[PDB]
């Protein structure tokens, strides 16, 4: 039994409630045990409890007297028990209950009014039971109930007589998922005082029954509606008729295997704001199919269209101007589909569109011309996602229409060509370009000329050609702060490659072949590419095969806070290499071949470090090699992960596998 002001006795196989708990506890957690009974006498001294959780037990029934023992009880969780029958005495004396959980108790039917004196109850959960009806009382009570959960039951009908007990109640959420309901008795929804959210997920309805349902929701106070997976195969302009008389703002129609969307199907919801149509089987989207939805601000069409039939060549066709009505649409997610291509007037109309996700939305978008994104001309687009579209070529002036574009993701494609610079023409407000994971990009001096306002450039694993150009291809990028050039295995770069990037803060260069460039044997000496980076904050140089480090490479890196030189063949470092790193807070040198740590190297480095990482190193356990290091470790404030565990010595054989933490420095 763990006491932390909240008594937690979970998974202890307790057959009886503990009697040694302090009189200070207010919460009791008894999930997963073997309690069959709950006597009141065992709960007398603990009259300060405000929350009780006894889920996953074998409790048969509940004593009325017990409810008198906890006058401060707010939340009661009785989920997954054997509590099958309820009476009026069960929860009678628990008037302060605000949350009651009764899931998976195999309750088949509720007697009279067990919850009549629970007028403080806010959330009632009766999920995963065997209730065939919704009647929970014969009078009006529970005016404070806001959530009624009735998931996974045998409820077949909603009757006014059974649901009018909440006439003076305001239900925010009426959960009726996984229920086979086949009829809605007239006036059942008006029987409730205030119904805001209706959830009919996993409920076999059909266009007709859903139509009658919508007719039943008319003139109500509904705001949220979820008809997900109701197998709504088709929709006409009569299906959502009743909803004409509602102020609905959220509609979920996902997982319905929706084949055809008839004209003016959603013309009855001019107040809808959130539309979920993800995961369907739409074969043909007509023009006026999305008419009337001029207040929608978010539309999700993920996997909403049919897959390619391969043989039948059955491609999901989207007619022109099909999105023109959603004038207030700001967020459009059409990712993961088999749309043939981008028509000339496909996205015409969306004059508030700020986010467009086209991730894998097309069968093959192999070429980006100047006419491709012409429909988005009058859209204030800020973010465009074009990943996983098999794009193999980007022509000039392809993004002229997206003048306000800020974030462009062209990653995860087959882009293999020469960047002339004209590909970025029009992007005056460009912020970041994600070009990672592609074929090949041949670089030129004019490659990024037209976009000097760029701050973040990602070229991870794309095979950069001519990156070793004398006038650096990155020269016009003055405002660049983050540059990713990892996984490219570039064997040659020049001195002035990072010239002009005085505002650069984060530099990723891991998994390249820059080793030869830093050896003393390299023609013309070492390549000091870290020259003039006065604002570099995070430097990544892992997995380069570095066996040598020149003394003055890290000279102009004063503001460098995090340095990553792990996963290299580094061993002996020259003196005063980190002499200019005063603002260093994180040092990474794990998985190297370091065999000596001396003061003349890690002196100014260990000054204000808060994170040291040299996990896998073959240290040498002698005085002149480890004394200063161990003596520093014993008195440092630096947080060192796996300090006593993985800091082992590989030499001398006397200290093989011996932790450096336990080395004796009294002999030195």
């Amino acid at each position, epitope marked *: 039994t763990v006491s932390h002001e909240v008594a937690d006795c979970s998974h202890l196989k307790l057959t009886q409630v503990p009697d040694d708990l302090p009189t200070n506890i207010t919460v009791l957690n008894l999930t997963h045990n073997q309690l069959r009974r709950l006597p009141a006498a065992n709960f007398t001294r603990y009259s300060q409890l405000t929350s009780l959780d006894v889920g996953f037990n074998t409790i048969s029934k509940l004593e009325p007297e017990l409810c008198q023992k906890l006058p401060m009880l707010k939340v009661l969780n009785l989920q997954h028990n054997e509590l099958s029958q309820l009476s009026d005495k069960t929860f009678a004396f628990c008037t302060n209950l605000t949350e009651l959980h009764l899931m998976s108790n195999s309750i088949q039917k509720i007697k009279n009014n067990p919850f009549v004196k629970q007028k403080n109850l806010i959330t009632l959960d009766l999920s995963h039971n065997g209730l065939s009806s919704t009647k929970l009382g014969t009078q009006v009570q529970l005016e404070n109930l806001q959530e009624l959960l009735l998931s996974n039951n045998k409820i077949q009908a909603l009757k006014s007589e059974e649901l009018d007990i909440f*006439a003076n109640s305001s239900l925010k959420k009426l959960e009726l998922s996984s229920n086979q309901i086949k009829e809605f008795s007239p006036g059942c929804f008006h*029987a409730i005082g205030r119904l805001f959210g209706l959830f009919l997920n996993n409920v076999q309805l059909g266009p007709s029954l859903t139509e009658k349902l919508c007719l039943e929701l008319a003139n109500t106070s509904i705001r949220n509606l979820s008809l997900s997976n109701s197998q709504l195969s088709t929709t006409s302009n009569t299906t959502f008729l009743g909803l004409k008389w509602t102020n609905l703002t959220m509609l979920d129609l996902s997982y319905n295997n929706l084949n055809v969307v008839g004209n003016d199907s959603f013309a009855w919801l001019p107040q809808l704001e959130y539309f979920f149509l993800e995961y369907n089987n739409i074969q043909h989207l007509f023009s006026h199919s999305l008419h009337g939805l001029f207040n929608v601000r978010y539309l999700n069409l993920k996997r909403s269209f049919t897959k390619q039939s391969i043989s039948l060549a059955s491609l999901p066709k989207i007619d022109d101007f099909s999105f023109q009505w959603l004038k207030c649409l700001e967020h459009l997610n059409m990712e993961d589909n088999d749309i043939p291509g981008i028509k000339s007037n496909m996205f015409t109309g969306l004059i508030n569109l700020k986010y467009l996700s086209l991730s894998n939305s097309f069968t093959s978008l192999r070429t980006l011309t100047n006419e491709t994104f012409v429909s988005l001309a009058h859209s204030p687009l800020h973010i465009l996602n074009l990943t996983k579209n098999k794009i193999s070529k980007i022509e000039s002036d392809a993004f002229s229409w997206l003048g306000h574009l800020e974030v462009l993701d062209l990653g995860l494609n087959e882009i293999g060509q020469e960047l002339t610079g004209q590909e970025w023409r029009g992007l005056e407000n460009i912020f970041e370009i994600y070009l990672s994971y592609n074929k090949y990009l041949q670089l030129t001096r004019n490659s990024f000329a037209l976009v000097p306002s760029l701050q973040r450039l990602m070229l991870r694993r794309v095979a950069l050609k001519n990156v070793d150009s004398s006038p650096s291809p990155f020269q016009p990028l003055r405002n660049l702060t983050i540059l990713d050039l990892s996984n490219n295995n570039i064997a040659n770069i020049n001195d002035d490659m990072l010239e002009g990037l005085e505002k650069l803060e984060i530099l990723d260069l891991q998994h390249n072949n820059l080793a030869r460039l830093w050896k003393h044997a390299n023609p013309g000496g070492p390549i000091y590419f870290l020259k003039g980076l006065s604002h570099l904050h995070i430097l990544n140089l892992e997995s380069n095969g570095f066996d040598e480090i020149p003394v003055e490479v890290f000279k102009d890196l004063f503001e460098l806070k995090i340095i990553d030189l792990g996963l290299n063949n580094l061993n002996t470092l020259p003196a005063s290499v980190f002499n200019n790193q005063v603002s260093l807070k994180s040092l990474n040198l794990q998985k190297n071949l370091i065999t000596s740590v001396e003061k003349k190297v890690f002196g100014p480095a260990f000054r204000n470090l808060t994170e040291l990482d040299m996990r896998f190193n073959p240290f040498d356990c002698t005085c002149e090699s480890i004394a200063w290091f161990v003596n520093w470790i014993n008195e440092t404030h630096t947080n060192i992960p796996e300090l006593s565990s993985h800091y082992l010595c590989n030499t001398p054989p006397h200290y093989h596998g011996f932790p450096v933490r336990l080395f004796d420095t009294s002999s030195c």
Partner: antibody, heavy 122, light 107 residues
Framework: QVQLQQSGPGLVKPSQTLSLTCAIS??????????WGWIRQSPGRGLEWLGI?????????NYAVSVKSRITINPDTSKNQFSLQLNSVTPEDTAVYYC????????????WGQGTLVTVSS | SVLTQPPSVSVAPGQTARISCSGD??????VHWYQQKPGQAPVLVIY???ERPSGIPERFSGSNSGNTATLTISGTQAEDEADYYC??????????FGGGTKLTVLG
């Protein structure tokens, strides 16, 4: 306080219709926190339950199997009363009728009527 | 439903009196006790098993457990001699009565 004034014919001929009227004072007929009904006591100290009536949204009234389909309790929101109609009466329908008020939650009768006596004799 | 009460129970004036009300698992429902004098209308003396309404003497206490609903009247007077009926709503039957109990107060 709440007072119930009960009245009706003391003599009803067989095969005809028994009628009764119970007027309420100090409470409303069409409102929650107040239930109503009829219960007769046949000569011989036999306390029987005829029916109850109450309102939540619609009008909900419950009868016994004994009264079968011969009974009908209709409320009058206008004059603040509730009546009793018993069709086809036999001499065993003769009883001391009491109109009753049930109090929520658990249906208890805090207020009874003074009771009227009916007789079937022709 | 089926509720059974003892036919007749007698008691000496000023002695602890006990009345029974039998039924299958009646300990799950709220039982009520009514008092009735000949020539008068029955008046509720016990609701919620143990609660005494406005204007009810403290001599009347009640309880309900298992299969037995028991009424208790300590200090029985000559005015306490009357009929007693137990009741409970339960199913859609909506008010179920018992057989009735006759109290007898000696000289």
């Amino acid at each position: 306080q709440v007072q119930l004034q009960q009245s009706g014919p003391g003599l009803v001929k067989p095969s005809q219709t028994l009628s009764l009227t119970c007027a309420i004072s100090g409470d409303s007929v069409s409102s929650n926190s107040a239930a109503w009904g009829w219960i007769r006591q046949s000569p011989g100290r036999g306390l029987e339950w005829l029916g109850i009536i109450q309102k939540r949204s619609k009008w909900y009234n419950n009868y016994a199997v004994s009264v079968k389909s011969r009974i009908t309790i209709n409320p009058d929101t206008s004059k603040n009363q509730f009546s009793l109609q018993l069709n086809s009466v036999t001499p065993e329908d003769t009883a001391v009728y009491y109109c009753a008020r049930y109090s929520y939650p658990f249906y208890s009768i805090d207020y009874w009527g003074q009771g009227t006596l009916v007789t079937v004799s022709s | 439903s089926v509720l059974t009460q003892p036919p007749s129970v007698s008691v000496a004036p000023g002695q602890t009196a006990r009345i029974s009300c039998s039924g299958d698992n009646i300990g799950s429902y709220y039982v009520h006790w009514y008092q009735q004098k000949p020539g008068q209308a029955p008046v509720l003396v016990i609701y919620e098993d143990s609660e005494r309404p406005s204007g009810i003497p403290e001599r009347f206490s009640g309880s309900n457990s298992g299969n037995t609903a028991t009424l208790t009247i300590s200090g029985t007077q000559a005015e306490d001699e009357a009929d007693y009926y137990c009741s409970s709503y339960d199913d859609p039957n909506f008010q179920v009565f018992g057989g009735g109990t006759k109290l007898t107060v000696l000289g």
